[PDB]
Amino acid sequence: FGVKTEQEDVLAKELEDVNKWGLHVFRIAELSGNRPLTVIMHTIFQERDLLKTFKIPVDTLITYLMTLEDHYHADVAYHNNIHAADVVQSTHVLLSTPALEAVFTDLEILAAIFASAIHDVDHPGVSNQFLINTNSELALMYNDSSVLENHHLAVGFKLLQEENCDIFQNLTKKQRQSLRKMVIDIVLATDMSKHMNLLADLKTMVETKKVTSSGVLLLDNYSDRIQVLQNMVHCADLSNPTKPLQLYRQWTDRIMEEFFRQGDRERERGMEISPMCDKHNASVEKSQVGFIDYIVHPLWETWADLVHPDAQDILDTLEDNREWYQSTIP
Ligand SMILES: COc1ccc(C2=NN(C3CCN(C(=O)CN4C(=O)CC(C)(C)CC4=O)CC3)C(=O)[C@@H]3CC=CC[C@H]23)cc1OC
Ligand SMILES: [Mg+2]
Ligand SMILES: [Zn+2]
């Protein structure tokens, strides 16, 4: 039969929501046999006609995607393939915002989406500080500097060398060099130690914002173009509290499981327990409200100004969720 199975039909119907904020990504993960990253990336590549544009052989794309997904750890609660798929899809929605229509080139679009897909690959489920404090091999390889983020990049690129995995094999050297630099700049910007400087620069850009005729953002140098892409993927990475609450709470459960596990390791070892990682002295709800107030809302408020009024519903959902978590603090 050259026709989908019923489970593949149910999956294809869920994937009709790929252009929407609030895609049922956990359901996609179940329906695809734990291939949310592969199926969501493929759908996006097809939808944006990236295979044709970059002459990517379909089998090579699928092989690379499965390989990349395979390098996300299934035994990690939050920083796994479902998170990668979610960041990919959220970036895909943000790239389609009316205020950015026709701003970015196909190569820049490719860069933002590919960066999103690789941005947490091979994450061990512990923080940079934990890796540094434990004298881990990763921290030694990267000289304690954006350890995880450098690692995600190195793995994401190295996997292109596996059998029939080089999705960029038909790009010119000039295209490849440009793509690579942008990908590196985007993934390194996902290190939360960079958040305050990224946000400061995004605020400066909003303050000196120029729009073209027809009211789309004018970005006429690399610094500004990459700043916007960096902040975009960073928004996607920090998008959990902006999603419908049924999704958000699953993300909260997962990050807390991950953090608590790290805290258990820190406690076993006699180390100081990192913020939000002590399961005996946690308030999950207060932690979410703090995460929103201090990190997520300042970023998304500034993004919303940049693309005004495109992100109003996202900001409203964020504010509703914040009130919900506040109302459950004992
Ligand atoms: C679903 O909820 C979460 C999803 C992801 C994260 C991540 N945590 N972090 C860091 C973010 C900054 N941080 C803070 O604790 C900052 N912060 C608060 O959020 C609340 C507070 C402790 C009361 C005061 C305050 O300053 C440390 C942890 C990461 O680095 C992860 C990797 C990349 C992006 C974000 C992700 C946290 C979530 O809820 C807490
Ligand atoms: Mg990360
Ligand atoms: Zn991430």
Backbone angles phi and psi of 77, in degrees to 5 = -65, -40
The technique is: X-ray
120 is in an annotated binding site: yes
For the chain, the first-to-last Cα distance in angstroms comes to: 57
Find all residues with CB under 8 Å of 193, minimum gap 6, and list them. 128, 146
Nearest partner of 136 among 54, 2, 14, 125, judged by Cα: 125
105: its two tokens? 């080139």
CA 88 to CA 9: how far, in whole Å? 22
**What is the Cα–Cα distance from 14 to 32, expressed in whole angstroms?**
10
Closest CA to 34 of 80, 77, 76: 80
Ligand 3 centre to CA of 126 (Å) is: 12
Distance CA 71, CA 324 (A): 35
C-alpha closest to that of 121 among 162, 176, 171, 158: 158
Q: How far apart are CA 330 and CA 320, in angstroms?
A: 18
The span from the CA of 130 to the CA of 233, in Å, is: 24
Hey, where are the domains in the chain?
1-330
The yes-or-no answer on residue 123 being catalytic is no
- Would you say 51 and 58 are in contact if contact means Cβ atoms under 8 Å apart? yes
Q: Is-contact 91 112, C-beta < 8 A?
A: yes
291 within ligand 1 shell (Cβ under 6 A): yes
CA of residue 36 to ligand 2 center, whole Å: 18
Q: How many CB atoms lie within 10 A of CB 72?
A: 23
Q: What is the CATH number of domain 1-330?
A: 1.10.1300.10
Q: What is the CA radius of gyration of the chain?
A: 20
Question: Catalytic one among 42, 71, 73, 79?
Answer: 79
CA of 82 from ligand 2 middle (Å) equals 13
Q: Tell me how crowded residue 250 is: count the other CB atoms within 10 A of its CB.
A: 15
- Taking the C-alpha atoms of residue 113 and residue 93, their distance in angstroms, rounded to an integer, is 11
Coil, helix or strand at residue 200: helix
* The token pair that represents 258 in the structure block: 């991950």
How do the residues of the chain divide into helix, strand and coil, expressed in percent and rounded to 5? 65, 0, 35
Q: Which amino acid is at 182?
A: M
Give the distance from CA 176 to its chain's centroid: 22
DSSP 58-119: HHHHHHHHHHHHHTS-TT-SSSSHHHHHHHHHHHHHHHT-GGGTTTS-HHHHHHHHHHHHHT
Please tell me whether the peptide bond between 244 and the residue prior to it is cis, using omega within 30 degrees of 0: no
**Ligand 1: which residue has its CA nearest to atom 26?**
294
Is 240 annotated in some ligand binding site? yes
Q: Of the bound ligands, which one is closest to the alpha carbon of residue 195?
A: 1
